[PDB]
């Protein structure tokens, strides 16, 4: 009956849980091999040395082990659901219960890519934590243990940029079986176009949080980097160009993010003007569906051009800390010709978007 996306939706949450303890339990054998391998470094005469790099194999190990995790659990509830939503349907439940069964589910995914960014940024901050009681004695030169730090970043930055690809592709899947197995049982078609502006939205949220994900990962490298002039090890020539590589990798990360993001959601809304105009809705209300998509893609341009705004304030307060303690005038030289590039990309990848978007628009307007 109407029970069987009640059990689904507990049968979910369960699941959820389920990988939160398992991402907690991932981190806390991190946190295992830290502390042994402190025990590890105790004025070495046979290894040493190499419980550095062994450190930094079990970052790189627990980071995989995170982002697999995270894969197949977010397979787990996308499966639950499309069999749920079908299961449902051939229950004849109402078709109305439909959408808001998958803008439920849709919800679920989404705090589990939240929950995952957060572990993948903890891990991130593990490894800080290690360099910090790192270099102590044994007095690891800032090459060795900043190498191995600025590698945990670019990881955790492609972990977090596939996360989110994932996450959207899961979410857009839902939504796109949704909205077919609604018209199929003759949803109103009013009714259509609406639940795909709900799911439009849930993606726009999940690329907001995704954004936040990226630029906090921006701020355990900066923070990371202070910890170089702390240990008087590393130099300002190289870890401060190690910085402003993890400045291009947020950046690029960022507008591959909203590149992304910005597909999903027209390739959600051309499906949903198309299955709309079969049932034949009023061309008045087509034309009005185009308008809220593309004011959702506009939406969604800024909010993602704040982001990489914010990449670039990180990027300026960075330079003048690093400045009073040049190289660091044309790092931020370097770090504004890269946002402003990622800023043009941004608007003319939308108004693209928003244009095609209108021409099937006229054309489903003319086919009436």
């Given at each position: 009956?109407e029970?069987?996306?009640?059990?689904?939706?507990?049968?979910?949450?369960?699941?959820?849980?389920?990988?939160?303890?398992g991402?907690?339990?991932?981190?806390?054998?991190l946190?295992?091999?830290?502390?042994a391998?402190?025990?590890?470094?105790?004025?070495?005469?046979?290894?040493?040395?190499?419980?550095?790099?062994?450190?930094?194999?079990?970052?790189?190990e627990?980071?995989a082990?995170?982002?697999?995790?995270?894969?197949?659990?977010?397979?787990?509830?996308?499966?639950?659901?499309?069999?749920a939503?079908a299961?449902?349907?051939?229950?004849?439940?109402?078709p109305?219960?439909?959408?808001?069964?998958?803008?439920?589910?849709?919800?679920?995914?989404?705090?589990?890519?939240?929950?995952?960014?957060?572990?993948?940024?903890?891990?991130?901050?593990l490894?800080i934590?290690?360099?910090?009681?790192?270099?102590?004695?044994k007095?690891?030169?800032?090459?060795?243990?900043?190498?191995?730090?600025?590698?945990?970043?670019?990881?955790?930055?492609?972990?977090?940029?596939?996360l989110?690809t994932?996450?959207?592709?899961?979410?857009?899947?839902?939504?796109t079986?949704?909205?077919a197995?609604?018209?199929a049982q003759?949803?109103?078609?009013?009714?259509?176009?609406?639940?795909?502006?709900r799911?439009?939205?849930?993606?726009?949220?999940?690329?907001?949080?995704?954004?936040?994900?990226?630029?906090r990962?921006?701020e355990?490298?900066?923070?990371?980097?202070?910890?170089?002039?702390?240990?008087?090890?590393?130099?300002?020539?190289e870890?401060?160009?190690?910085?402003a590589?993890?400045?291009?990798?947020?950046?690029?990360?960022?507008?591959?993010?909203?590149?992304?993001?910005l597909?999903?959601?027209?390739?959600?809304?051309?499906?949903?003007?198309?299955?709309?105009?079969?049932?034949?809705?009023?061309?008045?209300?087509?034309?009005?569906?185009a308008e809220?998509?593309?004011?959702?893609?506009?939406?969604?341009?800024?909010?993602?051009?704040?982001?990489?705004?914010?990449?670039?304030?990180?990027?300026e307060?960075a330079?003048?800390?690093?400045?009073?303690?040049?190289?660091?005038?044309?790092?931020?030289?370097?770090?504004?010709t890269?946002?402003?590039?990622?800023?043009?990309?941004?608007?003319?990848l939308?108004?693209?978007?928003?244009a095609?978007?209108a021409?099937?628009?006229?054309?489903?307007?003319?086919?009436?």
């Amino acid at each position: 009956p109407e029970e069987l996306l009640k059990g689904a939706e507990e049968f979910i949450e369960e699941l959820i849980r389920e990988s939160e303890e398992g991402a907690e339990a991932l981190l806390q054998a991190l946190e295992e091999a830290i502390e042994a391998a402190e025990e590890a470094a105790r004025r070495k005469s046979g290894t040493g040395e190499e419980v550095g790099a062994a450190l930094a194999a079990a970052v790189t190990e627990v980071i995989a082990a995170l982002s697999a995790l995270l894969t197949e659990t977010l397979a787990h509830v996308a499966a639950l659901a499309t069999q749920a939503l079908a299961a449902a349907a051939a229950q004849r439940v109402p078709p109305e219960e439909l959408l808001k069964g998958a803008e439920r589910f849709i919800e679920l995914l989404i705090r589990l890519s939240e929950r995952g960014a957060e572990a993948l940024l903890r891990a991130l901050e593990l490894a800080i934590e290690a360099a910090e009681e790192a270099a102590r004695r044994k007095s690891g030169t800032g090459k060795e243990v900043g190498a191995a730090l600025a590698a945990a970043v670019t990881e955790v930055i492609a972990a977090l940029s596939a996360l989110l690809t994932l996450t959207l592709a899961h979410v857009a899947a839902l939504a796109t079986q949704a909205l077919a197995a609604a018209a199929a049982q003759r949803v109103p078609p009013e009714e259509l176009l609406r639940g795909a502006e709900r799911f439009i939205e849930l993606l726009i949220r999940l690329s907001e949080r995704g954004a936040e994900a990226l630029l906090r990962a921006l701020e355990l490298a900066i923070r990371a980097a202070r910890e170089a002039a702390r240990r008087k090890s590393g130099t300002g020539e190289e870890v401060g160009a190690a910085l402003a590589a993890a400045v291009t990798e947020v950046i690029a990360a960022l507008s591959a993010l909203l590149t992304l993001t910005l597909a999903h959601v027209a390739a959600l809304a051309t499906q949903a003007l198309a299955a709309a105009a079969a049932q034949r809705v009023p061309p008045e209300e087509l034309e009005k569906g185009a308008e809220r998509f593309i004011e959702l893609l506009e939406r969604l341009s800024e909010r993602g051009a704040e982001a990489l705004e914010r990449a670039l304030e990180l990027a300026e307060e960075a330079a003048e800390e690093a400045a009073r303690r040049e190289e660091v005038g044309a790092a931020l030289a370097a770090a504004e010709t890269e946002v402003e590039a990622a800023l043009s990309a941004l608007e003319t990848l939308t108004e693209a978007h928003v244009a095609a978007l209108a021409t099937q628009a006229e054309a489903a307007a003319a086919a009436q």
